[PDB]
């Protein structure tokens, strides 16, 4: 706990105005999609 | 772009004809003019070609005060023209007889004409904040109160 | 002639001035949008819940 | 088109601070308008006259940027300077003819 | 040039008064960021601002 | 007051699968040799 207690003037650059939160996740707008693996075929002989 | 100026002055009589035709001539931009024209009778070819290019230089220069024209192409256009003016003057120098008084005077023309063309191209260079000099440091300009040990 | 032109000019001037002031009072106030990010506490309070991306369920 | 103006940095300013800053801005450009309305100043009048004299030729010569006639008579309050210059010449001329 | 001079007096009064027709944007309104970009700010992968470039934002 | 800001453009996006490449400054890198002052040895 002593680490938390220790917050000083020199730490104003790391913590102070609480600009970012590590403990609360954020998410980007998400949409519904699906993936399917679909075979394509070849026009012409597939050989050496 | 063309503009025809009409002078709206009526002394008497309002039964006027109307000139609906276009008769617009272009004016000379009286800036950056070569120093010596005594050669116009000996080298008509080069004297008039240089003056043509000078006129073009001067038109190209006046357009530099239109901000829209700001850019590298504008400056390079002037360097290209500068070379065409000087080219024709140089062609006169290369055709002079072995008379060093004519060589000195045409050189006077060449270098001083270049100093004026160069001063004006450096004018636009500076105000456009574009520091380019594709003009191989011509010796005619910059140097003052000193010349390199290379002359007539 | 000069006096008539003068008085007509003053009349037209007053008409334009008084009318223009009313129109200036009824000027559609152009508004510009300045956006400021939420404070961290307010952001956490008003953060969208994971149900906002429930398109998968 | 630059209708939306954003300050990306996390100022962490609360709701009341936003209201105070909004009031400050409204006052700022309200005074800015009041610097151009009928409540003028002699120093402002002279400055605007000089600005008109230096700007009306500037934009007609198309010196700075493309700009239409309605704009370049009004863009930088130049019509105030034009009006005050004509004011001075009209007064000094009516006095002379007397 | 007395008549044109009175016309100038008319014009000077009218123009000096008539300035209040064009001006800068007048009223400032403050709105919170849309959720997408505000959430983008408060995470990683956020470079510094440039004061310009008209950032694209979700709707 | 305006410390770090941008103009803001509304534009509907595909929620995902659009690469959004954000524009950067015009910079370039070069490896340049520096020289030593004093003997460079053990």
UniProtKB/TrEMBL annotation, chain A:
Compartment(s) of residence: Virion
Tree of life domain: Viruses
Name listed for the protein in its UniProt record: Capsid protein
Shown part of the complete sequence: 5 to 52 of 520
TrEMBL record, chain B:
Name of the protein this chain belongs to: Uncharacterized protein
Organism, as annotated: Paramecium bursaria Chlorella virus 1 (PBCV-1)
UniProtKB/TrEMBL annotation, chain D:
Keywords: Membrane, Transmembrane, Transmembrane helix
Residues spanning the membrane: 79-98
Protein's UniProt keywords contain Membrane: yes
Protein name: Uncharacterized protein
Species the sequence originates in: Paramecium bursaria Chlorella virus 1
Portion of the full sequence shown: 49 to 146 of 148
From TrEMBL, chain E:
Keywords noted in UniProt: Membrane, Transmembrane, Transmembrane helix
Sequence intervals crossing the membrane: 2-22
Organism superkingdom: Viruses
Name of the protein this chain belongs to: Uncharacterized protein
Organism of this sequence: Paramecium bursaria Chlorella virus 1
Part of the intact protein present: 5 to 63 of 80
